[PDB]
Amino acid sequence: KPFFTRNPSELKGKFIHTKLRKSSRGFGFTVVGGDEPDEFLQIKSLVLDGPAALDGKMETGDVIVSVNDTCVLGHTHAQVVKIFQSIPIGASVDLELCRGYPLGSSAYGSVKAYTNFDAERDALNIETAIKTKGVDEVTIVNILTNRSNEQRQDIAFAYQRRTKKELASALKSALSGHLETVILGLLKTPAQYDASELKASMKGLGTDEDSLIEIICSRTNQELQEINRVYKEMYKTDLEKDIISDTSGDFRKLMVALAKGRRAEDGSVIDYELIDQDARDLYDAGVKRKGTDVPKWISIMTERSVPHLQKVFDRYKSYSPYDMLESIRKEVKGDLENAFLNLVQCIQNKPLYFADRLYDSMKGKGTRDKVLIRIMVSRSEVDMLKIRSEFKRKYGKSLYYYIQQDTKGDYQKALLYLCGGDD
């Protein structure tokens, strides 16, 4: 349960006092929370060109402590909104805000927002570590792996503002090897990281299909819209065109369909009749007949919602002697088969999917560092705790333990911080 108190003397972070004059379009910010009897009200967003943003003190996630010297900790959403609306135009409001409590963080991520966050202090310390004779990598790793992705963007902004140099460029020149790969990956936003991992996977027609498949099969609609937008910004070409240029056959049709990020959203009602019909269609399209009707498989597995397809795959076992994964291995081959196997795993149990990919990257000789690094970077704020839970349950030892055996040095220490702990 999120922390809550009605006493200001028990709040965690730092306090900001603001004075805003009401404009024609209000004070220019939105708030969330205050429905549960014990829930903070926090700043959801700030209207640009509005009083709150132009003042410069208010920030997203801040807890509203008091309004016009009345403490509003514990007050309902409706009571506080009424206070702001009753203020006439030109009158002012006095706000005390508390900065340190986060908003909208995943419950299953391993990397949490640092509470006493000071972007300027972090940039200063990173610069000192970069300029140290024989780079101080420990400080660089200790900081960046203990900050959320959003905070790393603030660190990079404060670093560029002080030194007039990009933080990623300075770290690229100071770090090397697998440690450099991890740190530079942490510095990108989730969409920037996936977009550049996708571009790298399509270096030629001899494509690292594993990486393309892994990203496109495991990303959600929301994540794929931002990837498609950011990919075109960074590389001035649509992601779909590069997939079309880099794939062929039914494998191409499947990757293009998934990358659109237009999967049907999770419905409120379970459609039991469509569940049975989809299961029969998957059976009729494959195991039941000679050959395979691949477009029917692509259509059902790319367009239906994930909760729907989980029940479809269970109902499919009623008609077919083999489950969906085994049916795929019997019906198709090559990149098409690998893509269907990854997609079905992502639908059925995405944390287990990443746990198996982590095991494969380390089990044998050496390491598939590219796979291991990308997963530890991209899932550390999504579902890393479920990935660790599935890993320890299946393999007996923790993901932490396997990372220790396969990697060494500051590289290992960074991966262990992204892991989050032993199991």
Binding site: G28, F29, T30, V31, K44, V47, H77, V81
Partner: peptide, 4 residues
């Protein structure tokens, strides 16, 4: 979620 309410605008102010």
């Amino acid at each position: 979620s309410t605008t102010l």
